[PDB]
């Protein structure tokens, strides 16, 4: 997921 960072569009609604 590091090579595919997409947290820029991720809500804390779903557990990481």
Swiss-Prot record:
Outcome following mutation: residue 13 to R: Only 23% zinc-induced amyloid-beta protein 28 aggregation
Annotated positions binding Cu(2+) 2: 6, 10, 13-14
Mutagenesis or variant effect for residue 5 to G: 60-70% zinc-induced amyloid-beta protein 28 aggregation
Residues annotated for Zn(2+) 2 binding in this entry: 6, 10, 13-14
Subcellular location: Cell surface
Residues carrying sugar: 10
Source species: Homo sapiens (Human)
UniProt protein name: Amyloid-beta protein 40
Subunit and partners: Interacts with S100A9.
Residues marked Cleavage (site): 1-2, 7-8
